[PDB]
Design a protein around this motif. Structure first.
Motif, mmCIF file in Angstrom:
data_model
loop_
_atom_site.group_PDB
_atom_site.id
_atom_site.type_symbol
_atom_site.label_atom_id
_atom_site.label_comp_id
_atom_site.label_asym_id
_atom_site.label_seq_id
_atom_site.Cartn_x
_atom_site.Cartn_y
_atom_site.Cartn_z
ATOM 1 N N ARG A 1 -8.079 0.162 3.110
ATOM 2 C CA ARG A 1 -7.195 0.166 4.106
ATOM 3 C C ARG A 1 -5.937 0.748 3.434
ATOM 4 O O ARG A 1 -5.785 0.149 2.302
ATOM 5 C CB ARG A 1 -6.889 -1.153 4.295
ATOM 6 C CG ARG A 1 -5.827 -1.584 5.483
ATOM 7 C CD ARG A 1 -5.822 -2.960 5.953
ATOM 8 N NE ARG A 1 -5.481 -3.982 4.844
ATOM 9 C CZ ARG A 1 -5.329 -5.447 4.711
ATOM 10 N NH1 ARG A 1 -5.313 -5.792 5.990
ATOM 11 N NH2 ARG A 1 -5.034 -6.142 3.735
ATOM 12 N N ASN B 1 0.947 -1.118 0.060
ATOM 13 C CA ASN B 1 0.062 -0.007 0.023
ATOM 14 C C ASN B 1 0.850 1.216 0.026
ATOM 15 O O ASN B 1 2.043 1.119 0.334
ATOM 16 C CB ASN B 1 -1.035 0.147 1.300
ATOM 17 C CG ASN B 1 -2.189 -1.036 1.136
ATOM 18 O OD1 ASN B 1 -2.565 -1.146 0.148
ATOM 19 N ND2 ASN B 1 -2.353 -1.668 2.327
ATOM 20 N N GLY C 1 -7.060 -6.691 -6.703
ATOM 21 C CA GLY C 1 -7.661 -6.885 -7.766
ATOM 22 C C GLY C 1 -7.262 -6.297 -9.058
ATOM 23 O O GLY C 1 -6.925 -6.686 -10.091
ATOM 24 N N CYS D 1 -11.617 -0.255 -6.768
ATOM 25 C CA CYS D 1 -11.108 -1.202 -5.819
ATOM 26 C C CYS D 1 -11.465 -2.439 -6.369
ATOM 27 O O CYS D 1 -12.637 -2.967 -6.150
ATOM 28 C CB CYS D 1 -11.214 -1.184 -4.346
ATOM 29 S SG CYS D 1 -10.010 -2.245 -3.611
ATOM 30 N N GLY D 2 -10.818 -3.478 -6.932
ATOM 31 C CA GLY D 2 -11.189 -4.572 -7.646
ATOM 32 C C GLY D 2 -11.720 -5.644 -6.379
ATOM 33 O O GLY D 2 -12.697 -6.243 -6.694
ATOM 34 N N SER D 3 -10.685 -5.807 -5.607
ATOM 35 C CA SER D 3 -11.173 -6.862 -4.433
ATOM 36 C C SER D 3 -12.200 -6.277 -3.754
ATOM 37 O O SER D 3 -12.989 -7.046 -3.096
ATOM 38 C CB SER D 3 -9.885 -6.915 -3.617
ATOM 39 O OG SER D 3 -9.567 -5.913 -2.990
HETATM 40 C C1 ZDR Z 1 -8.398 -1.386 -4.169
HETATM 41 C C2 ZDR Z 1 -7.194 -2.445 -4.285
HETATM 42 N N1 ZDR Z 1 -6.341 -1.688 -5.088
HETATM 43 C C3 ZDR Z 1 -7.018 -3.158 -3.042
HETATM 44 C C4 ZDR Z 1 -5.549 -2.607 -2.440
HETATM 45 C C5 ZDR Z 1 -5.381 -3.303 -1.009
HETATM 46 C C6 ZDR Z 1 -5.718 -2.837 0.250
HETATM 47 N N2 ZDR Z 1 -5.428 -1.391 0.251
HETATM 48 C C7 ZDR Z 1 -5.501 -3.516 1.329
HETATM 49 O O1 ZDR Z 1 -4.767 -2.939 2.260
HETATM 50 O O2 ZDR Z 1 -6.373 -4.640 1.446
HETATM 51 C C8 ZDR Z 1 -7.755 -3.603 -5.383
HETATM 52 O O3 ZDR Z 1 -8.259 -4.737 -4.948
HETATM 53 O O4 ZDR Z 1 -8.078 -3.176 -6.365
#
Ligand code: ZDR
Length: 274
Positions: free
Chosen positions: A209, A64, A74, A217-219
């Motif tokens: 997060r 991050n 994702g 945010c894919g996930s």
């Molecule tokens: C939004 C996304 N970039 C997720 C990134 C991870 C998130 N900050 C975490 O700490 O879990 C995505 O899935 O695209």
């Protein structure tokens, strides 16, 4: 260190080949590089590594902007697929990767979109991780200004999914920070705010997060759809509209992998001395 800049729906990434380079850094360096005005500028930094299981193609690491290392992204997975193809680390249509947690499969489609097998959503609270006496389809999360109801699920990273009447007026700005660091989520959480248009169409905003509200945010899209399906409010194929654009999520339910399909774009290449 050579790197590439990419994005998926405006969620932007530095992607690093750590197969042909030896790549490592402190969280301080990550935060310096994430800064948009004095660094490279990114939401996440991803590393492509050699696999630990030699039957797989690559190992996938995610950082991050705040310097924290996590186990899923994702939009990043789609960018990862585009990167290893464009840069000639592989030419396979179906690319298998490991993460700190589970494996995934990245499929380069003929229309150039990427379909990602994100693995099966994880519901057991202790595994999310999330503090709860028992599994429930809805949990109560008290905050200083409002008590909300959410579904909770992991896609390799933790998500809390709150349903809202109107995506534009949802209090993402105040509730997002309160949920992201909620005490019931010991490793913090991605806070999703979902407006259900119909059983095959939602609008979503995610307070991430370690990154805040971003363009996509894919996930988060995966988690919101998984939660809606678990709650019986969504069908098995759902279009998710995020600020930066749309993703298609497909999930046939427990025991099955969840799929996420969408764009991934290479922007430029860079070189930086750490
Ligand atoms: C939004 C996304 N970039 C997720 C990134 C991870 C998130 N900050 C975490 O700490 O879990 C995505 O899935 O695209």
């Amino acid at each position: 260190m050579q790197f590439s800049k990419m994005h998926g729906l405006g969620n932007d990434f530095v992607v690093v080949d750590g197969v042909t380079q030896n790549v490592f850094f402190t969280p301080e360096t990550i935060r310096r590089l994430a800064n948009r005005h004095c660094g490279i500028g990114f939401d996440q930094l991803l590393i492509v590594e050699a696999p630990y299981d030699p039957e797989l193609d690559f190992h996938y690491r995610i950082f991050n902007a705040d310097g924290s290392e996590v186990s899923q992204c994702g939009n990043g997975a789609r960018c990862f697929a585009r990167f290893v193809t464009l840069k000639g680390l592989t030419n396979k249509k179906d690319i298998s990767v490991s993460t700190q947690k589970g494996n995934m499969v990245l499929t380069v489609k003929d229309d150039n979109q990427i379909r990602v097998n994100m693995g099966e959503p994880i519901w057991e609270p202790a595994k999310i991780p999330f503090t709860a006496n028992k599994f429930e389809k809805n949990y109560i999360l008290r905050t200083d200004i409002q008590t909300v109801l959410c579904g909770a699920v992991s896609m390799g990273n933790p998500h809390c999914v709150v349903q809202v009447d109107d995506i534009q007026t949802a209090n993402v700005e105040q509730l997002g920070p309160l949920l992201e660091s909620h005490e019931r989520f010991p490793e913090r959480v991605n806070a999703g705010f979902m407006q259900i248009i119909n059983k095959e169409h939602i609008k979503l905003r995610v307070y991430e997060r370690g990154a805040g509200e971003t363009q996509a945010c894919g996930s988060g899209a995966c988690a919101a759809v998984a939660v809606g399906i678990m709650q019986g409010l969504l069908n098995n194929n759902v279009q998710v509209d995020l600020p930066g654009g749309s993703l298609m999520i497909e999930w046939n339910g427990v025991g099955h992998p969840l799929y996420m399909t969408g764009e991934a774009t290479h922007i430029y290449d860079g070189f930086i001395t750490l």
